[PDB]
Design a protein around this nucleic acid. Structure first.
Lengths: 49, 733, 730, 340, 141
RNA sequence: AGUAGUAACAAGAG
RNA sequence: UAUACCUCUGCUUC
């Protein structure tokens, strides 16, 4: 609200002050590419994955 | 010529002019002094109705217990508490068979409600028996003390927020060998002073840890307080009512919620049906019974009322009722629901103040506490009390309390008992005899319709209903109940005569000034007229008269007569000035000696809103000054529509506490008040919405203020000085 | 402000008590420690206030500068005292202090006040702009119903409303985003813009918002008007014995017109049916009926709703007839085909028998649901075709489901699991089809699975879709998604087309007589005629009593001249048409008994004379139908007993007082001398007279089935009212 | 790693042991009742019980006939009892109001009573007591002294309406009559102390003064007493009908006797309550005032008598303040002595 | 209210404001008359205003003599009233323990003037009704 | 005394 | 014991 942007519908993990962007951290076991595009389905492009 | 006001009844029938048989302009009877006699009466009678049952000593409490359930049936019309379990279970089975799905659905709803129910829910129980100080306290305080006490015994269920862990801690606290709790005691401390002698002694209070043994704790947890009921209308002699502890509240809430969820779906239960809807139920329920047996079918209505309603119904039945009703529910919920009856089955009754003995010769008087009740020759008590105290003995406890296994207290399981009544109404017939009964139930008050071919059968149907109710521990009042041919009847002071008539008297006391404040009482005052015009049959003339009478009462009570009038008074002296100063006088509120602008058509409109355009800017500015000191910190039974202005004030606190040992609670209060007032400044929504979280109350404020600081800095509100200072402060915290 | 909060926090944290409180107390428990106080519940505030007002300094001030702006005294009068209040820890004061503050206090900012309390002012304009009408004295049937007390801005559930309020007032503390925000974003935007500059405390704004968002619905005695802007004035609208025409200002809803319109038309029809040349009455009345302010003409013309009666009237005044239907959310218009309802018993999927009205005959409708439009072709329990357009998924889905249910397809009926006899929140049983709607709107997977699929259309403009409302080669069986988007009326109110076929049935309207929404007015003499059972009954018997002088005289002169009179047409509109004749034939005979023979009973004459209007119907034998009580439409109460009195009609011969629906009338000075020991058996059954008194040898009290089968000149026992045996002969 | 999330709520030994002994007769423990309820089918139990239950248990119904309705309260006709005595707070029918014509606007009560007594000086100056009848346990001297103290106190030139706390005032008020509270430890040892037998209302018989009170209070006068304030202007027809109805309904009561009596009670209690709280420890004199308008439309202030307010440190709502009434009358008590 | 109910009920019957009619009478109707009281053992007809004032007076006396005795007496006697109404309407009313009703009522008659008078009035009225019953008892039969 | 009515007040407390 | 012809209290429960 202070920065003047849309509120993420899910709870993000971090927020970058210089970029004014929310960040979502993921810790996978196998491949990262698998865990990435699965998140893309939920978060679209709201948070930085 | 001797006037006789009864002779009106020659012309107008009694239901048509029933309002004239209610003396509600008169004064209601209040109690005086102790109620111990009335309590003891109840204790004696409650056992009197079950003394042929099973007597046994409770190995837990050490108290004398009496059990009527599944006992010998009565051979007389004396109030019987000897209910038969099987019959109750059958009566239930019938209800379940005719209302399938309800029993489990209600339980699921109640369960899913319970799971969501938090602890704060308990704060809205009004007067609650505080077991720590053994006094009736505000529910919130009684709860807070119990939580703070539980914390000392390593029981932090409350910290989770939900009700379940708290209740768990409650049933767990029974197992504790010694229950510890706080008790405040004072300390002198020399504070510096400019006082010849350079110091001052102020008694600083400090909390002390105090212990109670398992049994003595359990006895308190099972105890119920008692007091005489004041202002009870339509009755000569007074009677006693009880108050419960904090423990059982959570367990009762669920049971009553369940019984509510059940009752809502029943068609022959008048609970929790609004008085307006009760007619919608009743008139229809009658309409059904009317057009059912045309051929000489005598439909009779029975104006019912039960005797010893609370004193005959036994917890042991309610336990079975919960056990049956919760059939499909999981075990934990059954165990949860089973508790409150189990507690009420082993409850203890406190006997109020005691008895006052006196000497007229010496002009001396003294109260004898219930513990010291027997520390005196019984001959020194009066003739009746001497008889009572002798009968009390077998159920009397050393610490001055009365064991009371059977019976219920006045207003406890209203829903669940109403269910048991409906269960009686659910049978409708016995032995395939040529009749059918139906009716409406409401706690101790019931209305029974009976259809049959000849009245000789109807009466036997009624007799069957009576003899049936006996088996449920429900006792009909042969003295107060009466039967007649269907067409007219009475139910909870609502009178049916080919249609429910008005009973304007009933609501008449409400017309007076309520006693909230100048702002509210007006709105309330007009709204009551507005409503009574609609529901209770008040014509426009009488309404317009009431509009006048209320202003009359309003202006005297709040001493705010017309600014043009010459009535003297401290306020009036200023009101007159305001009258002289103000231009838009019709804009002035009555509270400010303004003219009454209300009539029939604008009762539903707030006075400020009505007169707003007629006010002067300075007057409305002062009257509605946003930060005026008269209105306190507001926080969101009947509600009203009013505007927050200077007349929306609150009165001073009762000061009698100042010169007693409870002074502490003022500091204890304000100590919270400061934290909450700040927490509200950190979280503005706290006043509206209930904050949620099991984390620290400080942490939230720290984080929130940190973010506020950071954003106020980076946005460009605070300067580097203020930001660094803020972060420097927060850093220490 | 943050710095001040942190500073106060640090100053507070110094106090070990406050520190421990803040550290130990939880965010949940805040809700507890807030309500902690020494205060006690006032059990007699009415008294305690009257007492307190006689004290010197009853009020408590808030600690602050605005309090300090109040002086200690003023021209001798003590305004406030130094002594603090236990609760507020601010100075205490007398009520006078209020009167001072209002007179010489600081003038504060009131900008925004009107927008904040707008909700209330809207009442004031709804009254100020209103226009009043006539007041009329006469009976009023009040039906006790749950109604909305005040008109809202936008009705939401409490949970949904609180979140919106939270979004408006405390956006940072709203927590988890809900869908509501997206739905009411414009409302939020608006209220945010309207409530920006004001200085009033948020806790008040939330209250006023909640007042105009959350609904207050309560049971009340209502008659005619039920709209909120009428309910809020209900106390003035009506009584039990009077009526007041009231026209509230401001704009009124369209649906509110649509609601009343139907009731009005139905009520016109129900009356005009009984009188010969129905069209004449229907037109006469409909010409001069008024809905609040709009005439029924203007309404029927402007609104494109109606149902059955509306079309019939529409064709009676002369305008198009929109044959539109509403299945819950699904809105239909008729393209072609006129089906017929037939009550059958269907064994539904879950394994239960259900009595449902199946619609026989082929039918084609123009269909619309929310935003999704289409065309529906159905036959007896079969979806023949469903040609819809593309739209939002929920609308497409719900359209297809509502069409599937509306079509009464066996594939739908045999797609039920569990139970579908759930009540509504109040505890009322829904109708067979609407239950299936309410069910399949939720659980649709069974339907979609049980439905079946087929090849999609390969025409370029046509497409097929699957269960998740997406394009597919395998479409639902009978479903298609396409890219492309005179009459006359009979005397007896049936609508005929040029080809002779009839499309509207006069006997095809609903008998259900519900309460209107707006003020239903009849700008004609004799309004009552379009009234409730009891209203008509009462007015009728009143009209009888009013003219009893002539009516009782002519009954010794004009044979069947009285039985038909203008006033009774109304009354008859109450009576079940399946009994009207049977009653009339009986009443006329029992009356003719009192005429031709020397046994009169004015109280009975008055009771029966209205029932004799409808053309009579005797039995095969020529004898009439015997009765214990004459039933009327609606409410088990509404019946006229023949021997006994009744909820509608009873007579007290001690005072010669006639009771009509509760109202008292005096027959004294209008009763013959010999009616003292004149038994009632001589006017209870037609062609029967009292011989002696109850003779045990005759046996029991013989019922009507026996009495009708008794041969002429044969004694029998009859029970008048309870405790009055009589011996009667044919 | 997945697990089901069941609700954790289990009973301890104490509460379980309590539950075990919270069962109907014929059950070893709770589990027995639980299984019993969950399993067995009791259909037939009701009738099987009703069969074995004693016939004596019944409702014993009887059809009501008029001769069964015997007159209620057979003792009220018995002359062996004392007829019920007048026990109201103020006088009703027997009232006598000293009338003083005014502008028709509020003045100070003392000034009012002063001017009224100024008009009717002949009675005010009467210091010579002519005793007609005397309440059994009253004190002529104290009462008359109290009356004179009232009259003179009100008649004087100063503002205060306070009475000197004399002996007669202390008697009439009942000073120090409360018993002294003491420790239970003492009272227990003191064998002379006993619980008082409660005072039960006496059994009175019928008295005609009630009948007459009813006959008179319901009668019309030429004097209106009500103080009905203003209301908003009429707009809707209903309001005009109401307003037009009030002219018939209200005036019919306002012109009658009971109205004035009522207004007297109201206006009196209004001030009495105020003095009771404002001046707790001060004995104060309060006039029995009532403004009245005659058919010509002239505001007469009516003074029916003077009342002495006792000591009013009223804590509990039921706590009593003793008030001594001195009320003018035209009734010769010797006529109906049983009334007084 | 109690009388405006009658004015409204009447106005319902004749379709206009029957106030003036009830009070003073008018062109069409006679004035309302009620059985107001007794006189040497016979009824007396009082006007609407008197019937109003009688109720107002009664309501005043309810306050002026209001206490537990009045509450108990009114409450418990109201039942017997209702029964008497049931009898007046011939609705064949049954009772289960009348001595209970009576015992319940009569304990409330001790030293309250209005109670003790109301009992007397009640008995007088109850007396005058039984003369009225003799009209109904032999109807038809 | 009186209020009042199955038990209280007619001041309490430091 | 004293301060105390003082002080506090009027629904604040023991």
């Amino acid at each position: 609200q202070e920065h003047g942007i849309e509120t993420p519908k899910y709870l993000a993990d971090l927020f970058d002050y210089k970029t004014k962007r929310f960040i979502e951290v993921g810790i996978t076991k196998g491949l990262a590419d698998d865990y990435f595009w699965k998140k893309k389905e939920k978060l679209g492009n709201s948070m930085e994955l | 010529m001797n006037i006789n006001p009864y002779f009106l009844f020659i012309d107008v029938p009694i239901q048509a002019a029933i309002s004239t048989t209610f003396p509600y302009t008169g004064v209601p009877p209040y109690s005086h002094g102790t109620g111990t006699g009335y309590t003891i009466d109840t204790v004696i009678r409650t056992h009197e109705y079950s003394n042929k049952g099973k007597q046994y000593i409770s190995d837990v409490t050490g108290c004398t217990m009496v059990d009527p359930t599944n006992g010998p049936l009565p051979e007389d019309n004396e109030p019987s508490a000897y209910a038969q379990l099987d019959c109750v279970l059958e009566a239930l089975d019938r209800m379940d068979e005719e209302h399938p799905g309800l029993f489990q659905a209600a339980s699921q709803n109640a369960m899913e409600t319970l799971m969501v129910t938090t602890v704060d829910k308990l704060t809205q129980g009004r007067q609650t028996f505080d077991w720590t100080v053994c006094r009736n306290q505000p529910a919130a305080t009684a709860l807070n003390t119990t939580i703070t006490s539980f914390r000392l015994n390593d029981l932090n269920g409350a910290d989770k927020g939900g009700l379940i862990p708290f209740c768990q801690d409650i049933i767990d606290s029974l197992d504790r060998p010694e229950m510890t709790f706080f008790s405040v005691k004072n300390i002198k401390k020399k504070l510096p002073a400019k006082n010849r002698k350079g110091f001052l002694i102020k008694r600083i209070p400090m909390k002390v840890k105090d212990k109670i043994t398992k049994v003595e704790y359990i006895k308190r947890a099972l105890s119920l307080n008692t007091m005489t009921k004041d202002a009870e209308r339509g009755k000569l002699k007074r009677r006693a009512i009880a108050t419960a502890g904090i423990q059982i509240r959570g367990f009762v809430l669920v049971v009553e919620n369940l019984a509510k969820n059940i009752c809502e779906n029943l068609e022959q239960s008048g609970l929790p049906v609004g008085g307006n809807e009760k007619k919608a139920k009743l008139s229809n329920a009658v309409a059904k019974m009317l057009s059912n047996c045309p051929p000489g079918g005598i439909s009779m209505t029975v104006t019912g009322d039960n005797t010893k309603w609370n004193e005959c119904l036994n917890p042991r039945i309610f336990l079975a009722m919960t056990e049956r009703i919760t059939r499909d529910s999981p075990i934990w919920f059954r165990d949860f629901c089973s508790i409150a009856p189990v507690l009420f089955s082993n409850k203890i009754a406190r006997l109020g103040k005691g008895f006052m003995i006196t000497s007229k010769t010496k002009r001396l008087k003294a109260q004898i506490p219930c513990p010291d009740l027997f520390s005196i020759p019984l001959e020194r008590y009066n003739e009746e009390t001497r008889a009572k105290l002798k009968k009390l003995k077998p159920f009397f406890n050393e610490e001055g309390t009365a064991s009371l296994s059977p019976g219920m207290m006045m207003g406890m399981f209203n829903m669940l008992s109403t269910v048991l009544g409906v269960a009686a109404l659910g049978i409708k017939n016995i032995g395939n005899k040529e009749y059918l009964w139906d009716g409406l139930q409401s706690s101790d008050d019931f209305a029974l319709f009976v259809n049959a071919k000849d009245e000789e059968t109807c009466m036997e149907g009624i007799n069957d209903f009576y003899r049936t109710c006996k088996l449920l521990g429900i006792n009909m009042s042969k003295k107060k109940s009466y039967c007649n041919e269907t067409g007219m009847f009475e139910f909870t002071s609502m009178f049916y005569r080919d249609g429910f008539v008005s009973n304007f008297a009933m609501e008449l006391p409400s017309f007076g000034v309520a006693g909230v404040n100048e702002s509210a009482d007006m709105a309330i005052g007009m709204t009551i007229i507005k409503n009574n015009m609609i529901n209770n049959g008040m014509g426009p003339a009488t309404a317009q008269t009431a509009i006048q009478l209320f202003i009359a009462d309003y202006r005297y009570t709040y001493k705010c007569h017309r600014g043009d009038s010459k009535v003297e008074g401290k306020r009036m002296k200023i009101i007159k000035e305001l009258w002289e100063n103000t231009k838009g006088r019709d804009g002035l509120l009555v509270a400010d000696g303004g003219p009454n602008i209300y009539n029939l058509r604008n009762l539903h409109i707030p006075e400020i809103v009505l007169k707003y355009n007629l006010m002067d800017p300075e007057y409305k500015g002062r009257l509605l000054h946003p930060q005026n000191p008269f209105v306190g910190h507001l926080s969101i039974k009947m509600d009203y529509d009013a505007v927050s202005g200077t007349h929306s004030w609150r009165t001073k606190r009762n000061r009698s506490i100042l010169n007693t040992d409870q002074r502490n609670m003022i500091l204890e209060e304000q100590c919270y008040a400061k934290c909450c007032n700040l927490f509200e400044a950190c979280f503005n929504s706290a006043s509206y919405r209930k904050p949620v979280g099991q984390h620290s109350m400080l942490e939230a404020m720290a984080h929130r203020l940190r973010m506020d600081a950071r954003l106020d800095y980076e946005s460009g509100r605070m300067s580097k000085d203020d930001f660094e200072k803020a972060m420097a402060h927060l850093g220490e915290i | 402000m943050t710095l001040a909060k942190i500073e106060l926090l640090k100053q507070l944290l110094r106090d070990n008590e406050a520190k421990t409180v803040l550290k130990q107390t939880t965010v949940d428990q805040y809700n507890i420690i807030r309500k902690f106080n020494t205060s006690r519940i006032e059990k007699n505030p009415s008294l305690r206030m009257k007492w307190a007002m006689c004290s010197n300094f009853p009020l408590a001030l808030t600690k602050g500068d605005m309090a300090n702006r109040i002086p200690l005294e003023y021209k001798g009068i003590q305004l406030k005292t130094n002594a603090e209040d236990i609760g507020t820890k601010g100075q205490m004061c007398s009520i006078a202090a209020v009167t001072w503050w209002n007179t010489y206090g600081p003038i504060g900012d009131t900008e925004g006040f009107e927008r904040v309390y707008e909700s209330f002012f809207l009442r004031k304009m709804r009254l100020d702009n209103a226009t009043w009408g006539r007041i009329t004295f006469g009976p009023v049937e009040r039906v006790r119903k749950r109604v909305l007390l005040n008109p809202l801005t936008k009705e939401m559930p409490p949970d949904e409303a609180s979140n919106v309020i939270m979004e408006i007032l405390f956006p940072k503390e709203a927590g988890i985003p809900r869908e509501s925000t997206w739905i009411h974003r414009e409302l939020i935007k608006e209220k945010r813009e309207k409530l920006k500059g004001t200085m009033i405390t948020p806790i008040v704004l939330a209250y006023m918002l909640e007042r105009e968002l959350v609904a207050r619905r309560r049971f009340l005695p209502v008659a005619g008007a039920t709209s909120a802007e009428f309910i809020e004035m209900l106390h003035c609208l009506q009584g039990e014995n009077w009526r007041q025409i009231y026209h509230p200002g401001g704009n009124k809803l369209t649906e509110s017109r649509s609601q009343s319109m139907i009731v009005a038309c139905r009520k016109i029809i129900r009356r005009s049916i009984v009188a010969s040349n129905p069209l004449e009455l229907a037109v006469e009345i409909a010409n001069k009926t008024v809905i609040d302010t709009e005439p029924l003409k203007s309404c029927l013309a402007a609104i494109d709703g109606g149902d059955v009666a509306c079309d019939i009237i529409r064709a009676a005044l002369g305008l198009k007839i929109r044959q539109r239907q509403r299945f819950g959310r699904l809105e239909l218009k008729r393209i072609s085909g006129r089906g017929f309802k037939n009550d059958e018993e269907i064994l539904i999927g879950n394994g239960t028998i259900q009595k449902i009205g199946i619609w026989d005959g082929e039918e084609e409708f123009h269909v619309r649901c929310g935003e999704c439009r289409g065309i529906l072709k159905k036959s007896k329990m079969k979806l023949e075709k469903l040609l819809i357009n593309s739209a939002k998924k929920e609308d497409m889905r719900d359209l297809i489901i509502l069409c599937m249910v509306f079509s009464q397809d066996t594939r739908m009926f045999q797609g039920v699991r569990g139970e579908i006899n759930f009540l509504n929140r109040a505890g009322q049983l829904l109708s067979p089809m609407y239950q299936l709607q309410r069910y399949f709107l939720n659980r649709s997977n069974d339907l979609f699975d049980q439905w079946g699929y087929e090849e999609s259309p390969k025409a370029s403009e046509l497409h097929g879709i699957n269960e998740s409302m997406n394009a597919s080669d395998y479409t639902l069986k009978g479903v298609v998604v396409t890219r492309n988007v005179k009459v006359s009326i009979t005397k007896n109110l049936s609508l005929i087309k040029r080809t002779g076929e009839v499309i509207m049935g006069a006997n095809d309207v609903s008998e259900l007589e519900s309460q209107a929404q707006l003020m239903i007015t009849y700008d004609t003499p004799k309004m009552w005629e379009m009234g409730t059972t009891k209203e008509l009954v009462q007015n009728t018997y009143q009209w009888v009593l009013k003219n009893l002088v002539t009516l009782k005289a002519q009954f010794l002169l004009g044979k069947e001249d009285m039985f038909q009179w203008d006033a009774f047409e109304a009354f008859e509109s109450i009576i079940p048409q399946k009994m009207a004749g049977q009653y009339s034939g009986f009443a006329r005979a029992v009356l003719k008994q009192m005429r031709d023979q020397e046994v009169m009973k004015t109280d009975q004459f008055i009771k029966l004379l209205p029932f004799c209007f409808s053309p009579p119907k005797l039995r095969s034998n020529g004898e009439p139908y015997q009765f214990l009580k004459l039933v009327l439409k609606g409410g088990g109460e509404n019946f006229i007993e023949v021997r006994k009195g009744s909820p509608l009609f009873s007579y007290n011969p001690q005072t010669e007082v006639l009771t009509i629906c509760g109202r008292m009338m005096s027959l004294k000075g209008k009763i013959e001398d010999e009616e003292r020991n004149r038994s009632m058996g001589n006017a209870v059954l037609a062609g029967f007279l009292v011989s002696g008194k109850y003779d045990p040898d005759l046996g029991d009290f013989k019922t009507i089935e026996e009495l009708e089968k008794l041969k002429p000149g044969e004694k029998a026992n009859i029970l008048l009212y309870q405790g009055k045996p009589v011996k009667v002969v044919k | 790693e997945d697990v089901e999330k069941g609700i954790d709520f289990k009973l301890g030994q104490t509460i379980s042991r309590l539950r075990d002994i919270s069962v109907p007769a014929g059950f070893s423990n709770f589990e027995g009742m639980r299984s019993y309820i969950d399993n067995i089918d009791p259909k037939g139990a009701i009738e099987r019980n009703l069969a074995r239950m004693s016939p004596l248990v019944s409702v014993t119904p009887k059809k009501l006939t008029w001769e069964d309705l015997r007159p209620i309260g057979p003792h009220i006709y018995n002359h062996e009892l004392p007829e019920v005595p007048y026990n109201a707070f103020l006088l009703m029918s027997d009232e006598l109001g000293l009338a003083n014509m005014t502008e028709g606007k509020s003045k100070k009560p003392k000034t009012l009573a002063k001017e009224c007594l100024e008009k009717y000086s002949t009675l005010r100056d009467q210091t010579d007591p002519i005793l007609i009848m005397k309440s059994e346990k009253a004190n002529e001297n104290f009462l008359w002294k109290l009356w004179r103290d009232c009259v003179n106190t009100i008649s004087n030139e100063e503002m205060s309406n306070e009475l000197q706390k004399t002996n007669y005032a202390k008697w009439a008020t009942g000073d120090g009559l409360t018993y002294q509270k003491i420790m239970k430890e003492v009272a227990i040892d003191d064998e002379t102390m006993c619980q008082e037998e409660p005072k039960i209302p006496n059994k009175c018989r019928v008295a005609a003064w009630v009948q007459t009170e009813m006959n008179l209070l319901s009668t019309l006068t030429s004097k209106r007493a009500l103080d009905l304030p203003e209301i908003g202007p009429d707009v809707a027809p209903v309001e005009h009908v109401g307003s037009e109805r009030r002219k018939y309904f209200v005036n019919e009561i306002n012109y009658c006797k009971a109205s004035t009596v009522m207004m007297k009670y109201v206006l009196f209690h209004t001030s009495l309550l105020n003095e009771s709280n404002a001046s707790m420890g001060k004995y104060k004199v309060i006039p029995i005032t009532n403004r009245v308008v005659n058919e010509k439309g002239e505001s007469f202030d009516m003074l029916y008598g003077l009342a002495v307010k006792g000591q009013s440190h009223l804590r509990g709502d039921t706590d009593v303040v003793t008030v001594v009434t001195f009320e003018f009358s035209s009734t010769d008590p010797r006529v109906d002595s049983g009334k007084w | 209210q109690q009388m405006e109910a009658i004015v409204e009920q009447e106005s319902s019957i004749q379709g206009y404001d029957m106030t003036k009619a009830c009070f003073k009478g008018d062109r069409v109707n006679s004035p309302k008359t009620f059985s107001i009281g007794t006189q040497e053992g016979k009824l007396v007809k009082g006007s609407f205003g008197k019937a109003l004032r009688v109720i107002f007076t009664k309501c005043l006396m309810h306050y002026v003599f209001g206490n537990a005795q009045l509450e108990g007496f009114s409450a418990e006697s109201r039942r017997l009233l209702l029964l008497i109404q049931a009898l007046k309407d011939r609705k064949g009313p049954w009772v289960f323990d009348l001595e209970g009703m009576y015992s319940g009522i009569e304990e409330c008659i001790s030293n309250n003037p209005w109670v003790i008078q109301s009992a007397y009035w009640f008995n007088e009225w109850l007396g005058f009704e039984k003369e009225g019953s003799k009209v109904l008892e032999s109807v038809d039969e």
